[PDB]
From Swiss-Prot:
<comment type="function">
    <text>Activates valine (or leucine, but much less frequently), and then glycine and catalyzes the formation of the peptide bond in the first step of peptide synthesis. This enzyme may also play a role in N-formylation of the first amino acid residue in the synthesized dipeptide.</text>
</comment>
<feature type="region of interest" description="GART">
    <location>
        <begin position="3"/>
        <end position="145"/>
    </location>
</feature>
<protein>
    <recommendedName>
        <fullName>Linear gramicidin synthase subunit A</fullName>
    </recommendedName>
</protein>
<comment type="similarity">
    <text>Belongs to the ATP-dependent AMP-binding enzyme family.</text>
</comment>
<comment type="subunit">
    <text>Large multienzyme complex composed of 4 subunits; LgrA, LgrB, LgrC and LgrD.</text>
</comment>
Length: 580
């Protein structure tokens, strides 16, 4: 009878479709390569049927075979045109079906002949779906072929719109072929790009702090032994120092070093640096004079806020401002005119070394997530415990100041004696704070009735047994992505205590060495994306590039931690040590 040219690159030479056509006494030429007009595969052809053909047809060919080129495409067009349609059908959660349509000059733009709705069960694998569709369309072709040959079907134009996908759009998703529909949608919900409608962060920390001063001005801000400052008192003194600093020429993105012990003067100095416009570099003065000398050299800091006592540990490296000299304080107590943007530096901290750069928007995002998460109110009282050279300090000070809470400085007297500290808290009625895993585990041993919440993380947490009523939370995150990026409420004991779910405006991805996504439950190198990412390492652009990358598929900016982890079925993340 008639000679049929069958085009495919993926499909077998013995498809149900080919056998049916041969059953009807058609000679079926099978071709899997691109062809041109001169091709001997185009001699004496009545119908062209194409099924997963991986090449376009020159206009020359489609015109000569107009009205006689059929394509088998397993999607409910115009949904899911182009490559890997069955997959994108699941991922993009489009309607699912199979379509036989004429071949137009453009990809999958030909008028429809027949169309069928298909269904996938939550339990089917993505390879199950791929087959179930090819099954459905092959059977459909056999049912309606006769109707197609005799030309008795009225082609109808495809509905406007649709989705289109390209060959390489699945690269990022190569490891997901054997995933379940349920398991695949779960992964999307955990790792898919942010939903539309969100706006950049438009505030700096000292903006929001000055905001909070006017709401709770007479509330206690910071306490150190018997001395205390209200938000109003604290704000005005920082302003006086900030005026002085901006007079000395502090400007946005400038570095100002602070070398002091935990004290009211420290909080004033920190806020004064921000309000002036710059970012503060905390230097614990117990560091070896070697480290201190380096931190001041690497840092471009021209100003140093410090004591008469620690003055000499800098060896005249820079201009010094005595926080105890009343001449370092201006008469003006007004808030300074704002000159900062959220992309300006807020602080620079050193890892165990390199200068990590953090911007205001990084810090704002963390505090704005912290307040509502832990339901912090001005009734709360928190401790300044961590060294002021670690990002754990930023949590202690900043989160609670924007909640109107009261900060209590922790002297070395009870820094180590947790029995004595606990007595502090029970007397003063402390309700919340962060303790590193080491210190936190110890504190579980002391009796406590003050706390409402305690937070840990930084090293692996292994014990949960606590005496007090308070809830307990384990967190995770590197200094490079601003304090912590994930948070878990500990409800029951675990052999591996999970580190929780991501915070506001942050996303975490588990990737192959190839940087491809990994199914829920499969380990990989944990990657961070979102508001938390800092500016990088100071004076270390080549190394910054190493750790702050532009993903090859998505083009998003991500931080490579070098930690192993995996997602649990309920959405929480599980730490699995370093990558080695
Ligand atoms: N002329 C024509 N119209 C069609 O509608 C049609 C055909 N040919 N041939 C088979 C199928 C389309 N199949 C495909 C699938 C992918 C590519 C492809 O190579 N896409 C590249 C684009 C890059 C480039 O243009 O070089 C990609 O990266 O996604 C081509 C044809 N098809 C009807 O079903
Ligand atoms: N629950 C946890 N388990 C293991 N490591 C953690 C952790 N929470 C934080 N970290 C570690 O803290 C590091 C950043 O601070 P470090 O001082 O290096 C310890 C992270 O890179 C991460 O390796
Ligand atoms: C100390 C902790 C809050 C910090 N994210 C770290 O791991 O260094």
């Amino acid at each position: 009878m008639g000679r049929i040219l069958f085009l495919t690159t993926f499909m077998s030479k013995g498809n149900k479709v080919v056998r049916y056509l041969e059953s009807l006494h058609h000679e079926v030429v099978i071709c899997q390569e691109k062809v041109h007009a001169q091709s001997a595969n185009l001699q004496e052809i009545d119908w062209i049927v194409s099924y997963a053909y991986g090449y376009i047809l020159d206009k020359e060919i489609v015109s000569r075979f107009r009205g006689r080129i059929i394509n088998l495409h397993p999607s409910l067009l115009p949904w899911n045109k182009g490559r890997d349609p069955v997959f994108w059908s699941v991922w993009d959660e489009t309607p699912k079906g199979v379509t036989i349509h004429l071949i137009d000059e453009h990809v999958d733009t030909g008028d429809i002949l027949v169309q069928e709705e298909i269904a996938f069960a939550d339990e089917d694998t993505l390879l199950d779906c791929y087959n179930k569709a090819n099954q459905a369309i092959e059977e459909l072709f056999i049912r309606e072929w006769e109707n197609i040959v005799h030309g008795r079907i009225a082609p109808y134009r495809q509905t406007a719109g649709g989705t289109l996908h390209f060959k390489a759009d699945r690269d990022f998703y190569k490891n997901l072929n054997m995933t379940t529909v349920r398991e695949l949608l779960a992964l999307k919900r955990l790792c898919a790009e942010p939903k539309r409608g969100e706006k950049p962060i438009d505030k700096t920390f000292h903006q929001l702090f000055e905001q909070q001063v006017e709401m709770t001005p007479d509330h206690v801000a910071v306490v150190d032994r018997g001395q205390s400052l209200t938000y109003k008192q604290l704000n005005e003194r920082a302003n006086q120092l900030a005026h002085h600093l901006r007079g000395k020429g502090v400007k946005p993105d400038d570095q100002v070093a602070i070398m002091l012990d935990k004290s009211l003067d420290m909080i004033v100095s920190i806020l004064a640096v921000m309000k002036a416009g710059g970012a503060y570099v905390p230097i614990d003065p117990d560091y070896p004079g070697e480290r201190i000398a380096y931190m001041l050299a690497d840092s471009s800091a021209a100003i140093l806020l410090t004591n008469a006592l620690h003055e000499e540990k800098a060896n005249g490296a820079c201009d010094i401002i005595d926080v105890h000299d009343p001449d370092s304080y201006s008469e003006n107590t007004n808030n300074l005119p704002h000159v900062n943007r959220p992309d300006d530096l807020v602080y620079v901290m050193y890892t165990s070394a390199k200068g990590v750069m953090i911007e205001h928007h990084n810090l704002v995002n963390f505090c704005e997530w912290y307040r509502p998460y832990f339901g912090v109110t001005p009734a709360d009282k928190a401790l300044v415990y961590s060294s002021f050279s670690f990002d754990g300090s930023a949590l202690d000070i900043f989160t609670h100041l924007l909640a109107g809470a009261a900060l209590h400085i922790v002297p070395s007297e009870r820094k180590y004696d947790l029995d004595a500290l606990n007595d502090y808290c029970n007397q003063e009625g402390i309700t919340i704070s962060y303790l590193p895993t080491g210190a936190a585990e110890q504190f579980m041993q002391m009796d406590n009735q003050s706390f409402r919440v305690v937070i840990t993380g930084g090293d692996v947490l292994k014990k949960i047994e606590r005496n007090g009523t308070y809830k307990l939370y384990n967190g995770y995150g590197p200094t490079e992505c601003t304090i912590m990026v994930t948070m878990f409420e500990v409800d029951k004991p675990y052999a591996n205590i999970p580190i929780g779910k991501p915070i506001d405006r942050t996303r975490i991805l588990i990737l192959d060495e190839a940087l491809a996504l990994q199914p829920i439950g499969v380990a990989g190198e944990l990657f961070i994306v979102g508001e938390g990412l800092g500016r990088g390492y100071l004076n270390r652009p080549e190394l910054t590039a190493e750790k702050f990358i532009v993903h090859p598929q998505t083009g998003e900016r991500m931080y490579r931690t070098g930690d192993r982890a995996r997602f649990l079925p309920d959405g929480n993340i599980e730490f699995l040590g370093r990558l080695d």
